[PDB]
Design a protein around this ligand. Structure first.
Ligand SMILES: C[C@](O)(c1ccc(O)cc1)[C@H](NC(=O)c1ccc(C#CC#Cc2ccc(N)cc2)cc1)C(=O)NO
Ligand SMILES: [Zn+2]
Ligand SMILES: [Zn+2]
Ligand SMILES: [Zn+2]
Length: 296
């Protein structure tokens, strides 16, 4: 059978919050079967736990924020993207502040931590959510869709008209039958438009952002000296972001996500809309791994 997966060891890192600019301590820990990913604010007294589930998402402007009452954990999407990519079902994530550290802007540092912690198979079947019917949500010209697919595929199209994007692919469809999340998606850095970052900074926001943790473009050029990690890094990051949001379903997906100019708000609307319609999905397990359309 395909088994649930957790970490073998506790592991730690530090970094700064993209929004706050202040140092945060991160800890990833093993967790029992059927725990899911649970975030804990260990700086608070009492300590506050927030399960990484779609129903606990509050704000979704630019980042995905988990909320419980007045307590928040911001910017969960890149870490969760790594958890999803490596098929980690169960883990505890401890944080000394209200935001996951931005690290290098990608999911790579989290992939690194999870792999370094080691992968532990657990004595319970891994559950998957299989999409049975296509479901979509829209806002203006933005669209996010789940489509049935015998495997796991994430497709995305961005549609920027600024000169710096002219001639760029702005589209990718990744079938994880033959694409490595680790090698080909996880290291895509977050990006921002210079004018938008200036606006954030003018309000004392985005204080942790730098060219060392984000690709910054003006109307016409990429500001980062070293260029891009992947030829299509921008759309790959959107794919990364979508995989992280997808993991808030609480189980790995058998299906396809398609994004069109979509962001965290629409991604989360899609999750809640899917979850609510039981005719459109089912939970499956694989007692024989060789018969499965995915592999971890
Ligand atoms: C990628 C993302 O999805 C997104 C969402 C909306 C959008 O319009 C574009 C990108 C969205 N991006 C961010 O929220 C984002 C990305 C970059 C920054 C920044 C910065 C900086 C800086 C800096 C640069 C130069 C100097 N000299 C100093 C400081 C802030 C936030 C994302 O990745 N969310 O998961
Ligand atoms: Zn423009
Ligand atoms: Zn992102
Ligand atoms: Zn909704």
């Amino acid at each position: 059978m395909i088994k649930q997966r957790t970490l073998k060891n506790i592991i730690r890192a530090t970094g700064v919050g993209l929004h706050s600019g202040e140092k945060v301590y991160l800890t990833l820990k093993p967790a029992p079967v059927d725990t899911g990913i649970v975030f804990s604010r260990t700086d608070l007294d009492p300590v506050v736990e927030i399960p990484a589930r779609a129903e606990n998402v509050g704000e979704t402007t630019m980042s995905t924020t988990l909320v419980k009452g007045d307590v928040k954990v911001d910017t969960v999407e890149h870490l969760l993207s790594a958890m999803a990519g490596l098929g980690i079902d169960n883990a505890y994530v401890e944080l000394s502040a209200s935001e996951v550290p931005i690290m290098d802007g990608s999911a790579g540092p989290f992939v690194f931590l999870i792999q370094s912690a080691g992968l532990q198979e657990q004595e319970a079947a891994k559950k998957f959510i299989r999409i049975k019917r296509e479901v979509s949500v829209e806002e203006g010209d933005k669209r996010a869709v789940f489509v049935p697919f015998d495997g796991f595929k994430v497709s995305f199209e961005i549609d920027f008209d600024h000169p710096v994007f002219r001639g760029r692919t702005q589209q990718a469809s990744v079938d994880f039958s033959s694409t490595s999340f680790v090698k080909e998606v996880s290291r895509a850095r977050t990006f921002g438009f210079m004018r938008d970052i200036e606006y954030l900074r003018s309000q004392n926001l985005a204080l942790g952002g730098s060219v060392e943790n984000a690709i910054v473009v003006d109307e016409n050029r990429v500001l980062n000296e070293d260029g891009l990690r992947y030829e299509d890094e921008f759309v790959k990051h959107k794919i990364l972001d979508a995989i992280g949001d997808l993991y808030l379903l609480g189980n790995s997906l058998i299906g396809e996500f398609r994004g069109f100019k979509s962001g965290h708000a629409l991604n989360n609307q899609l999750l809640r809309t899917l979850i609510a319609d039981k005719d459109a999905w089912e939970v499956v397990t694989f007692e024989d791994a060789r018969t499965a359309p995915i592999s971890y």
